[PDB]
Amino acid sequence: TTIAGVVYKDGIVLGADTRATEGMVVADKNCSKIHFISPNIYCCGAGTAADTDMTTQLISSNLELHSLSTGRLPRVVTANRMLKQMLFRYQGYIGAALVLGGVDVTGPHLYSIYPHGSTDKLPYVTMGSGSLAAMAVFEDKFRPDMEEEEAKNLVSEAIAAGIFNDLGSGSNIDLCVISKNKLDFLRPYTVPNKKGTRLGRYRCEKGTTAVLTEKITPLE
Amino acid sequence: EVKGVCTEAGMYALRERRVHVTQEDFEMAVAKVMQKDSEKNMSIKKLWK
C-alpha cells in the first residue's frame, strides 16, 4: 500500500496503487483506493480496508446532507473536522490512515490523518506501508508551484518507487486530478507490470471428470 | 322526480316555440334532473378506503 498527494500551482494530484493482500498472499490485483467524498474532494485510504471503506462512506453521506441543506459547495476543513473528531472517539481502535485533498473557494488544501485523530496540513504527504519509499522521491524532486504535467510526472514516479518495494502492487497506477474547474480520474494510467504468456497445453477434455449424480432444474 | 323529467322535457319544446316532443328531449332532461353530490378532492375518500 502506497498513497501520496501533492499540491501544484492550481490544484491537487492524488495517487495510489491496486493491491490488497491477506497475510503474504496477494488477494486482489485491482483494488480502488481513491474514494469519492464530494464533487471537489477525494480521499485516499490506507490501513484496515473495511475500516477505511465504512468511514469514508459515512462522512461523504454527512457532507451530502450538509451541502444540500446549505445550498453551496462544501469545504475541505469541514471534512477535516468530521474525521478527526470521529476517530478520536474510538481511541484509535478503528485503523484508518487517510489523505484528504480538495479545492475550496479558499483554494486547494491537503491533509494527512492518523487513526488516533492527529491531522497535519502539508503540501505533500505519503501514507501506507511503502510511504518511506515514495517520500524520498518527493524531497529529492519537489519544488513549489509546479505545472500540470510536471506534477503528474512526480506522483507516478513516487508511487512506482513503492511498487518496486515490497507490498507494492499488481500495478495500475491511479491518478485523481482536482483543479478549480476540471476534475480527472484515471484508473489505467500506467501498467508497468505484465503477466507472461502461458506456453503449455492445458486441454480440458469434455468428460475427463467422473460425476456421481446429476440434476437439472429449468427456469423461465 | 319523474315529474321533473316530464316538465323539463316539455320545457325544451317551449323555448323552441314547438309542441312536438321527441325522445331526444327526454334524454337531455335525464342528465339535467339527475345529479350527484360530486365529492371533490378524493382525500376524504382515500382516508376512508
Binding site: 462512506q57 459515512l58 453521506s61 451530502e64 446532507l65 444540500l68 441543506s69 | 371533490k40 378532492n41 382525500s43 376524504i44 382515500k46 382516508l47 376512508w48 378506503k49
Partner: protein, 230 residues
C-alpha cells in the same frame, strides 16, 4: 361536536381533526404536477406580499436526492421539518444498500413519519400535502402524500386554492403522450388559471425530472419559456 381531540372516534363516522387538518391544505398556495412520457414537471405559485421580499432566498421546489424532487401546498414552516426528515432517511438506504433509493420507497417511509404525529395525544398532525417526483428504472413517477398518511400515483393533479378549477382544466387537458417541453407548456397554462395579476420570472418556480437526474430551473430559462409561449 364530539371532536376536540385525536385519540377517540365519533359515534357515526371518522376522525374529525384529520379532516380539519386537510382544510389548511386547501387554503394554501396552489401547485401543479404533470407526468409526461419522458419526465415529470413540478410547478408552483410563489408571490410575495410586498416588493421588499427577496425572491431568491427561500425556495419551493426542493431536491431530496440527485433524482428526486418535492413540492407542497400547506404551511411552509411545517414543510421544513419533513424535508429534513426525508433527507436523512434517504441517506440511511444508501448506507445500507449502496444504491439510490427508488421513489416508491420514500413514500412508504415518509408517510409513516406523517403517520406517527396522528397518534396520541398532545401532538398535532401536519397541515401539508406533498408531491414527490422521480425517474427510477426508466419509468418516471409522481406521487402525493397527505397528513392522514395515505398516498397515490398521479398522472396529473393540482393542490392548493381553486384546485377544482385546475382539475376540470386538466381533465379537459391532459393526454397520455407528450414530451417534457410540451408538459411545461400546459403546466404554466394551468397555473395561469388561478394565479394573480402579474406573472413574472419570480412569481413561478419550476423544477423538472429528466432521466439525467433532478433539476430546478433558473429564472433565465423560465423568463425565456414564459416569453410568449402562450
Amino acid at each position: 361536536g364530539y371532536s376536540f381531540s385525536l385519540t377517540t372516534f365519533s359515534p357515526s363516522g371518522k376522525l374529525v381533526q384529520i379532516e380539519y387538518a386537510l382544510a389548511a391544505v386547501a387554503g394554501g398556495a396552489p401547485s401543479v404536477g404533470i407526468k409526461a412520457a419522458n419526465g415529470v414537471v413540478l410547478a408552483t405559485e410563489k408571490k410575495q406580499k410586498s416588493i421588499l421580499y427577496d425572491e431568491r432566498s427561500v425556495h419551493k421546489v426542493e431536491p431530496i436526492t440527485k433524482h428526486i424532487g418535492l413540492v407542497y401546498s400547506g404551511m411552509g414552516p411545517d414543510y421544513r421539518v419533513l424535508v429534513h426528515r426525508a433527507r436523512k432517511l434517504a441517506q440511511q438506504y444508501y448506507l445500507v444498500y449502496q444504491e439510490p433509493i427508488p421513489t416508491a420507497q420514500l413514500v412508504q417511509r415518509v408517510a409513516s413519519v406523517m403517520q406517527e404525529y396522528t397518534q396520541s395525544g398532545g401532538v398535532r398532525p401536519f397541515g401539508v400535502s406533498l408531491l414527490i417526483c422521480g425517474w427510477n428504472e426508466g419509468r418516471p413517477y409522481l406521487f402525493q402524500s397527505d397528513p392522514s398518511g395515505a398516498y397515490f400515483a398521479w398522472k396529473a393533479t393540482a393542490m392548493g386554492k381553486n384546485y377544482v378549477n385546475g382539475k376540470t382544466f386538466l381533465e379537459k387537458r391532459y393526454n397520455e403522450d407528450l414530451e417534457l417541453e410540451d408538459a411545461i407548456h400546459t403546466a404554466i397554462l394551468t397555473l395561469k388559471e388561478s394565479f394573480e395579476g402579474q406573472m413574472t420570472e419570480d412569481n413561478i418556480e419550476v423544477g423538472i425530472c429528466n432521466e439525467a437526474g433532478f433539476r430546478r430551473l433558473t429564472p433565465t430559462e423560465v423568463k425565456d419559456y414564459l416569453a410568449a409561449i402562450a
